[PDB]
């Protein structure tokens, strides 16, 4: 029964929509300024900052030197005549709270909040690869493929925890193991008893990501440590590096900016009755009739801006550039050749040279967003003996399966997880780059609502979005 959850998601999107319309009225924005994605980012950020009860509770008692805690704000980009003018606006957090509740039938409706947070995620992942956090946390800058949802707060519920990657969970746990190595934070203090439950929970999510037995059991051996040290540190890093080949199940949900949902609701679309699903065709559909602008710096390429926002809308930040180009019809260029910077406009840029342009968020085909991490297919699990212990003194060779035994000694370690390491390594030795996953799955035409006819593409350039 998909109509129930489809109707719930639809009600969420309608909440965000009516909310964004009401907000566009509160500011009194033109039809163009309301479709500018920058102002949409400012609005969404204001809503997430207003409902940020942990941040507000930690900012009331200890205020940031910037501004009073009761008020949140952000730059709104307005255009009179032809000139762009950026104005800094401030609104009470309680006011934005009230407007959000009124737009969602009076409920808190945190689901839409987490939706906008995941949208912020996909945009941030598609915009910046955080090499600084990876080198400071002790990880490889070449592991950004696993860094989905790094900007997400741990406050995001199961909906936000599902979209995170293996590397994000590894990093988040590594901050906890590395924090407890300086002082006794795992101590018997109430902070320690609660932090142990946080740690075990995050270990369970990381265990849920992996789809091979060895990885899961290794995570189980990491969680057994009452006081994790450098050993569990290097263990979690080992798991993360294993997630490059033996990948984990990471959810991908197509989350759009609030101006798209708002323009759809303003046009009369009722998402409760019609239904909506992030993994279905609907987002693609909504993007084909979507009219969204974006501010553009002087020498930037508006097509590259459109590609950046497009990748942000389908979580394809770490996808194969070939298959993304096949979905969109136009070439999806890697980040190194993108003649653009972040969609966000800096606080020091002058609006005298700033312009705007239409965003080409359309795609030729469409495809089902997946939760899987591909085909991992290995479990020899032989229980047969492999060496001979001789009893009689007879001239013969003493047989043994040399490949298996000798392969059991590579990657050994003087810790409880040693075995698993070996197995993981062994499993990673069986996988090759050309191992095809998603057998039979293809792309579909936009007029194909029910995925009746797939299109399996044949590929000849580079596949990595980052260098």
């Amino acid at each position: 029964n998909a109509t129930e959850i489809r109707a719930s998601v639809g009600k969420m999107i309608d909440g965000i929509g009516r909310f964004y319309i009401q907000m566009c009225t509160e500011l009194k924005l033109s039809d163009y300024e309301g479709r500018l994605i920058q102002n949409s980012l400012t609005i969404e950020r204001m809503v997430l900052s207003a409902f940020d009860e942990r941040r507000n509770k930690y900012l009331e008692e200890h205020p940031s030197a910037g501004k009073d805690p009761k008020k949140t704000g952000g730059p709104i980009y307005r255009r009179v005549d032809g000139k762009w003018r950026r104005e800094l606006i401030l609104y009470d957090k309680e006011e934005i709270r009230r407007i959000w509740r009124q737009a969602n039938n009076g409920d808190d409706a945190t689901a839409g909040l987490t939706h906008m947070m995941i949208w912020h995620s996909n945009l941030n992942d598609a915009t910046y690869q955080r090499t600084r956090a990876l080198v400071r946390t002790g990880m490889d800058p070449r592991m950004c493929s696993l860094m989905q949802g790094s900007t997400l707060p741990r406050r995001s519920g199961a909906a936000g925890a599902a979209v995170k990657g293996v590397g994000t969970m590894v990093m988040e746990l590594i901050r906890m193991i590395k924090r407890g190595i300086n002082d006794r934070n795992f101590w018997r203090g109430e902070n320690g008893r609660r932090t142990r439950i946080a740690y075990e929970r995050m270990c369970n999510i990381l265990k849920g990501k992996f789809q091979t037995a060895a990885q899961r059991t290794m995570v189980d051996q990491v969680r057994e440590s009452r006081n994790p040290g450098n050993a569990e540190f290097e263990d979690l890093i080992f798991l993360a590096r294993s997630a490059l080949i033996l990948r984990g199940s990471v959810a991908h949900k197509s989350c759009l900016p609030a101006c798209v949902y708002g323009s759809a609701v303003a046009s009369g679309y009722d998402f409760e009755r019609e239904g909506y699903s992030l993994v279905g065709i609907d987002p693609f559909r909504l993007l084909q009739n979507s009219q969204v602008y974006s501010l553009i710096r002087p020498n930037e390429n508006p097509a590259h801006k459109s590609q950046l926002v497009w990748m942000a809308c389908h979580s394809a930040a770490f996808e194969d550039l070939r298959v993304s180009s096949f979905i969109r019809g136009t070439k999806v260029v890697p980040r190194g050749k993108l003649s653009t910077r972040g969609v966000q406009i800096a606080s020091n840029e002058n609006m005298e040279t700033m312009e705007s342009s239409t965003l080409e968020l359309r795609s030729r085909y469409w495809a089902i967003r997946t939760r899987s991490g591909g085909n991992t297919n290995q479990q020899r699990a032989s229980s047969g003996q492999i060496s001979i212990q001789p009893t009689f003194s007879v001239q013969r060779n003493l047989p043994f399966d040399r490949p298996t035994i000798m392969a059991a000694f590579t990657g050994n370690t003087e810790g409880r997880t040693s075995d698993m390491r070996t197995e993981i390594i062994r499993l990673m030795e069986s996988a090759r780059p050309e191992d095809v996953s998603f057998q039979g799955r293809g792309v579909f035409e936009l007029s194909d609502e029910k995925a009746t006819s797939p299109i399996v593409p044949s590929f000849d350039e580079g596949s990595y979005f980052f260098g």
Partner: nanobody, 122 residues
């Protein structure tokens, strides 16, 4: 519902001059900017000129600097492209573009187009 009708093209000789005219729809008459692109034979569509409205500034490509001058008519909604010192390199198909917010070289930033008018400079 094509939004821009362009005319004035034809056949001239090197060193001559021509004047391309682009009729502008009511949507297009009041827009952020409008420009001119050219498509040489067998080549991709390249930029020629761009005229902004609120202020009068213009942008030109290096090949036509000085020779070309993109102007606009007052009391009428018509775009003009003055083409002097015409050369064989100028042989192309000239499209009229207009953008709701972009005044720039890239073709991508312009949201309405015409159907060309031939300029052959033999």
């Amino acid at each position: 519902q094509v939004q821009l009708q362009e005319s004035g093209g034809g056949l001239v000789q090197a060193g001559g001059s021509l004047r391309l005219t682009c009729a502008l729809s009511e949507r297009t008459s009041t827009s952020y900017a409008q420009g001119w692109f050219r498509q040489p034979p067998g080549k991709e569509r390249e930029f020629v000129a761009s005229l902004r409205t609120h202020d009068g500034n213009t942008h030109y490509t290096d090949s036509v600097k000085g020779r070309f001058t993109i102007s606009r008519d007052n009391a009428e909604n018509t775009l003009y492209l003055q083409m002097n010192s015409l050369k064989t390199e100028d042989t192309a198909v000239y499209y009229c573009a207009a953008s709701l917010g972009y005044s720039g070289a890239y073709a991508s930033g312009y949201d309405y187009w015409g159907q060309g008018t031939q300029v052959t400079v033999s």
